Structure formats: structure tokens, C-alpha cells
Amino acid sequence: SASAVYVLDLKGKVLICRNYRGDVDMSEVEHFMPILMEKEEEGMLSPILAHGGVRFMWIKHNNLYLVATSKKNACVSLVFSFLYKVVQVFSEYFKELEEESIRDNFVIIYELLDELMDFGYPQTTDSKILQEYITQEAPRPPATVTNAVSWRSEGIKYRKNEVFLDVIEAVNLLVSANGNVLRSEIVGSIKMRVFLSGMPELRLGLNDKVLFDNTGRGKSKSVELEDVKFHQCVRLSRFENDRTISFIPPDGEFELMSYRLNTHVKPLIWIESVIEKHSHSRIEYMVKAKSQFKRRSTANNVEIHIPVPNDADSPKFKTTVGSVKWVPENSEIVWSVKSFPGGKEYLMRAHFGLPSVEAEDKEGKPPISVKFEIPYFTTSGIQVRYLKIIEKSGYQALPWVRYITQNGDYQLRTQ
């Protein structure tokens, strides 16, 4: 229940503001910057600000703070969701999120902000629906928003009905300094870029553990996602009733389902770090990377980031496979490998000097994170069974899907 949502700038200047209720004065935005500065200098800065009896919730955007001032006890989650929807709409309409597009599309930006929400209650949130009624280069509102199906616009015609899916896998491993993995969770991502004619109702079907158990086929390899979230077009009633993923696919790229469950398998890449750091004399980087993934899968663009000393200089890299580059801005050395086949063993020996004068304050021990990404690999083993594409007119669809395996929160605690 934010009183007015406004877009700030890096210097505190409000790029654009639009009051929705009028219960909060527009002059409260100026005091938001000093409050944020005071909070940052004292560690009390939070996204949801508080200026007396009015709370100024702000979100750190690409270049400006989306401050949404509120007066009463409005829904904080609702305000955050509205801010996220506005950010997504701006990203869809404008490819750049900065001051360049804030002051360049003000005529259409004001109209979009007015149409999005009224009296603090959002009304329009579909990017396609918003673009079909408000454009930067006006007709009546589309019937899709008024109709029940607000995620599949009718009347879409295409020469060919091709849908491109993406089985995105995020391998996150939280390995402590003792060598044991604490947080090992893999989050699935079933995103399909449906581009066909009409408004077909997708019938999602995969090798789900629950579905296999219900059907009596709980004997093969089935993916058991701990948390499964359906898309907006996905009907939750069918999923609750008999796990039937039946929904109208959207026009374009959209996320249908996103699995999220813990992983009890060994890490795809096993990285062991050795720190032979002398007392203000030299530093040793005994980094050894072991590929725990299948040999048939290659980790393309593998970048194992090893944090080097903050004041370290004149470093020497002695590795076997993969180029090692030290970035002064990042204050770490990343063991970048173009191709990392499964089972590969890469050993590196870093050696660099240190300044004679000791550091005044400690710099910490940031965890070592790798950027391994091996496509065409299904670590979870979940295989899509079928995709029920049904259209009233009747057409032969040719959906496609690709499985991509990458490294997410795969951070190893430093010694």
C-alpha cells in the first residue's frame, strides 16, 4: 500500500515519480537520500526505509533506487511484487535500465505508470498487454486483460509452430573450509520459448517422482523436486488434483516450471585450494581441480575463481590446463578453462610476493567460487515425457528443448 512509487538516481535525484494515493507529500523523497546515507555509514540501511510515520521502501535498481513511499501498514510483499513487476516491464520495454532511458521515454513512461496501478492497487502487469495498449512510437484496452486468459493473447498467427525449451540446471554447493559441503541444492528451471499460431494449451509431462508413483511406474529414474512452482498460465487446480500441468503457453519466452530440491550427489567439480602464504614474503596457490562429472560431459567456460591476496603483486602462475589471469579489480585469480571435460585433473601453482609493510586491517577470506557450465548434462536425471500441445484449429507442433547444466552457488569456503 505504497503512497507513491518513484524512481530515484545515483545522486539522489528522482528520475520519475508518480503518486497513487496522495497521502504522502512528494517532498519526503529528498529526506530519503540522507536517511540512506546515514544507514549505510552505520550499517542500519535497509530496503524498506522509515521517514517518521511514512515508510519509504526502496529497491536497488541498475542505476536508480525505486523508492516506493508508503504511509499506512500496506502490504510490504505486495509493494515488493509491484516494484518487481514495474522493473520487469521497464526492462521489457527499454533494453537499458539507467538514466539514459529514464529521461528519454518520459511520455510513455508516465502513461505506463498511470495504467499499471491506480490508488496504490496494481491493475496491469502483463508486458505484452501493456505494450498492446501503451506504446512509445491509443486504442481501447485489449480484451485479454478483461478475459480470464491474461497470459495467452488470442489471434496470434505464425508461419511455423516452434517452441524452444530450456532445461536450465543450477548446481549450488556450499563447501565449508573443512572440506564438507553444507548447502548442496540444485534448482531446476523449465523455461520454454513458445512461438506458434493461436493460444495452445500446453500439457506439461515429465518423469516426475510423484507422477510415477501415482501411475505405478515408480521404478525408473524420476526427478523428485522438493519445491515446484508453476507459471502464471499453469493451472494450479490440475496440479493439485492429479499433477496435470495444463496451461496456455505464453507468446514468447516464459518460465513454466522451476524445480527446487536438495542434491545428495557428489559435486560436479572438486576444487581443493592450498595457501602456502609466507609471512610477508610470498604466497602459494596450490589449487587442484578434479572433475567429478561424467567424462562424456565437458564443462565449457570453466572459471574457478581463487581469491588472491589483496596487496599481492608480481604473481606467477604455474598450472597445467586452463589459462590463469589475475584481475586487480577482482583481487583474485580465476582458473579460466575454455573446455573442461569430465574427469579432468587440473593442478595450478601460484606464486607471488607481498609488500614488506603489513596491512593495517584484515581483508577476510571470501569463498572460492567456480563458473563451470557443462551443457547437455542432466545431473538430476529428470527427463521430459511429453508436451501436450493442443489447438482448437488443429496443427502439428514441433517443440524443442535443451538441457543446460551450470554452476550456481558453488562456493567453497576458504581455509
Partner: peptide
Amino acid sequence: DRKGGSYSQAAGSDSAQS
């Protein structure tokens, strides 16, 4: 070709489930 796994054709439903 495409990085991250080549696109593969998908079926319509589980033919073994009737």
C-alpha cells in the same frame, strides 16, 4: 549448434501410460 546443449524434439505425452 548451440552452447548449453543442443535442442531436442519433445513428445506429446507418455505413450506407455495409456
